[PDB]
Paper text:
To test the possibility of a pre-existing 53BP1TT homodimer, we created a 53BP1TT mutant (53BP1TT-PN) in which E1549 and D1550 were replaced by a proline and an asparagine, respectively, to introduce a 3D structure-preserving β-turn in 53BP1TT. We verified that the structural integrity of 53BP1TT-PN was preserved by determining a 2.20 Å resolution crystal structure of this protein variant. The backbone dynamic properties of wild-type 53BP1TT and 53BP1TT-PN were quite similar as shown using NMR relaxation measurements. As expected, 53BP1TT-PN also bound UNC1078. The most likely interpretation for the absence of interaction of 53BP1TT-PN with UNC2170, UNC2991 and UNC3474 is that these small molecules do not cause 53BP1TT dimerization directly. Instead, they only bind to and stabilize a pre-existing 53BP1TT homodimer population, shifting the equilibrium toward homodimer. When overlaid, the 1H-15N HSQC spectra of wild-type 53BP1TT and 53BP1TT-PN showed small chemical shift changes that map to the inter-53BP1TT interface in 53BP1TT-UNC3474. We showed that 53BP1TT constructs engineered to prevent auto-association—while preserving the ligand binding cage—have no affinity for the small molecule ligands, and yet, they bind H4KC20me2 and p53K382me2 like wild-type 53BP1TT.
The localization of 53BP1 to chromatin also requires that it binds histone H4 di-methylated at K20 (H4K20me2) via a tandem Tudor domain (53BP1TT), while BRCA1-BARD1 recruitment requires unmethylated H4K20 recognized by an Ankyrin repeat domain in BARD1.
Numbering used by the authors: 1482 to 1603
The structure:
Amino acid sequence: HMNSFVGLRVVAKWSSNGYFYSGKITRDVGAGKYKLLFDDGYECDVLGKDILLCDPIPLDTEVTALSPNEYFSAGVVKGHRKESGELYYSIEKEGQRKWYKRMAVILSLEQGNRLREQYGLG
């Protein structure tokens, strides 16, 4: 039904790793899989059920923000904005909000499962 998923930004995980990372679909490789180019440069084929077609990550989503002191901490998306073409998320934690670059925001398995119903490609 869909014209094409190529070029769409997503957050996706591979198997045996429980986090979703931001990336983009570069190719429909069939077999229910898509070639995903992660923002860090890593590229591999991922199952449709492991892809959340949401960009930006919606507001009021509980996410995992990579934080100072190599600290991964759960927080809630309260805003996003483009800064010279780059997407930044406003994440609320301990009742305070801070800006994080796109790549510093990931989803744990539980956090991503909450979005599968609405945004998953399963």
